[PDB]
C-alpha cells in the first residue's frame, strides 16, 4: 500500500534527477563538439 506507492514515487524522482544531470551534460559536451567543427570550417576556408 503506502510502501507500494512509495516505490513508484522514488522511481519518478530518480528519473527527474537523471533528466537534470543530462541537461548539464548536453550543454557541456556541445562546447567541445563544435569547437572541432569551427576548426573544420577554418580548415575548409584554408583549403
Amino acid at each position: 500500500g503506502i510502501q507500494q506507492l512509495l516505490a513508484a514515487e522514488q522511481e519518478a524522482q530518480h528519473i527527474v534527477a537523471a533528466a537534470r544531470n543530462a541537461k548539464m551534460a548536453r550543454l557541456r559536451q556541445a562546447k567541445e563538439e563544435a569547437e572541432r567543427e569551427i576548426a573544420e570550417h577554418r580548415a575548409q576556408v584554408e583549403r
Binding site: 500500500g1 506507492l5 514515487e9
Partner: protein
C-alpha cells in the same frame, strides 16, 4: 432636473442589474458553501505529493460505505481522471462516534432523547423504547377525553400544513413545536386514550 433624471436612470439600471445579480448569488451561496466544505476538507485532511492525491481516513457507516465509496470512485472515473478514487477500509483501536439512522417521524423523538448523550457505534439506544414509552406515560398526567381531541386537532393542522410550513419560517417557539408534530400527535392520541 437633468441630474435627477440621470440619477433615476442610473438607479433603474443598477436595480435591473441587481435583479439578476441576486438570482446568480442564490446559486453562488451553494457554490460558496461547497467551496467552504472543500476548503475545510483540505485544511483538515492532508495529502501525499508522492501519491499526487488527497488521502486520509475517517468514520463512515458500513452500509453507507458499501455503496458511497463505489459511487465516489465511479464519479472520479467519470471526471475524466486517469484513475478513480480509492475505496479501501481502515482500522483503528479508537471508537468513532456514530448515530443510528433517523426516520422521518422517529427523528424528532430521537433528537429529544439524544439530549442526554450518545453511545458506541452499535451500543444501546434507549430511544427505541422511549419513542412510545414517553407517550405511554405522559398521557396519564393529562387524561381527559375532551381535551386530547383538541390537542390532536391542533397537531393535525401542523401535519397538514407541513408542506407550506417546511418553507415559511415561524416563531422560534412555534418552530420548535412544529419540529415535533408527529410526536405531539402521538402524545395527543395517547392522551385521548387515557
Amino acid at each position: 432636473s437633468e441630474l435627477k433624471t440621470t440619477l433615476d436612470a442610473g438607479l433603474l439600471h443598477r436595480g435591473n442589474l441587481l435583479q439578476t445579480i441576486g438570482d446568480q448569488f442564490e446559486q453562488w451561496n451553494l457554490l460558496v458553501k461547497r467551496e467552504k466544505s472543500i476548503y475545510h476538507t483540505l485544511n483538515m485532511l492532508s495529502l501525499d505529493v508522492t501519491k499526487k492525491c488527497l488521502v486520509g481516513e475517517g468514520w463512515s457507516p458500513v452500509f453507507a460505505t458499501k455503496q458511497i465509496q463505489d459511487a465516489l470512485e465511479r464519479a472520479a472515473f467519470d471526471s475524466n481522471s486517469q484513475v478513480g478514487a480509492i475505496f479501501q477500509v481502515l482500522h483503528t483501536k479508537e471508537s468513532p462516534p456514530t448515530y443510528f439512522r433517523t426516520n422521518k417521524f422517529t427523528s424528532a423523538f430521537q433528537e429529544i432523547v439524544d439530549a442526554y448523550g450518545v453511545a458506541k457505534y452499535r451500543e444501546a439506544n434507549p430511544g427505541v423504547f422511549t419513542i412510545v414509552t414517553f407517550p405511554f406515560l405522559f398521557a396519564v398526567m393529562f387524561g381527559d377525553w375532551g381535551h386530547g381531541i383538541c390537542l390532536l386537532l391542533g397537531t393535525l393542522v401542523l401535519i397538514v400544513r407541513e408542506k407550506k410550513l417546511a418553507s415559511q419560517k415561524l416563531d422560534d417557539i412555534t418552530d420548535m413545536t412544529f419540529g415535533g408534530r408527529y410526536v405531539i400527535l402521538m402524545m395527543a392520541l395517547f392522551s385521548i386514550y387515557t
